[PDB]
Amino acid sequence: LVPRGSHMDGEKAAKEVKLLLLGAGESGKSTIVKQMKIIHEDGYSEDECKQYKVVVYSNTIQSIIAIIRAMGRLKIDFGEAARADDARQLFVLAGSAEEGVMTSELAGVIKRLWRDGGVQACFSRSREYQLNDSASYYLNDLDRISQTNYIPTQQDVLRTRVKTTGIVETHFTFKELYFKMFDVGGQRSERKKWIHCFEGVTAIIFCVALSDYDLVLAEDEEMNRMHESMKLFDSICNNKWFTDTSIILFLNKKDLFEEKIKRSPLTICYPEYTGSNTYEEAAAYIQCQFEDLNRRKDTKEVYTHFTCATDTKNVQFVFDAVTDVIIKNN
């Protein structure tokens, strides 16, 4: 009889990293959670992907409906009058794919609408109704996603937009560190829950949608999205809870920002900006706008990264650097 050894068996306890994802809606937080799942975890199994079929269809239909309604609000006519009929059917059949089944009729409606010239004229002005950034992804792949045998690919799942009700968490192991990553939205909660959420936080990743710089304001909004995010990041940087915390800034959606900066002047967001409307200088200006909100720059540093949260390779690289920083400060 050989007495059994210790349960640990010579293994040390893993160091735990409490990481908080913060940022305004649509900044890329949940996309980063899903990227963590893809990179440092199992990925997504077919039983997991089949679950997102209904979500893919719902996001597609909601996006095309948002564009169609925007057309009515913006006084944009259809390129071909026939499309009106299609539009009507889209509202009749909007709930047809709740069973995960997109009928051929609905697919034809969406295809004929997405083809129209007026619908594309409205899509190009998407900034006037804050269209979500996954619309074109699904709509341009309509032929593929419409098939009956269709199962969402991993990139299809990254692009889904899901409503968050409770505690969105993911866990993984990276560089012998146990990461507890919590996605924190804008929901209202009890103060004790916030105290528990902000206690012992090792790192914060604050996500900022650069491409939100030119979006119109919704009614009763006191300021544009970029300035809302600047307000949030100010409160984050200069708070007592996070004096110990590593503050990381993900200037996300750089791929969309690069295409936008050509057509849309940064002055829409920052009227004082006198620089050029190029990717490099506008990006530097936004970076400095957020960084200068740090009112204790000597004692505390802000680690800034430009990211495309939907690009798994870029996210992997950036998170490797982020983890190096976390280790350095521990």
Binding site: L22, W194, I236
Partner: peptide, 12 residues
């Protein structure tokens, strides 16, 4: 009552 995390942080 219930409050967003931003308003919670700024309460101080």
């Amino acid at each position: 009552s219930r409050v967003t995390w931003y308003d919670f942080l700024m309460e101080d």
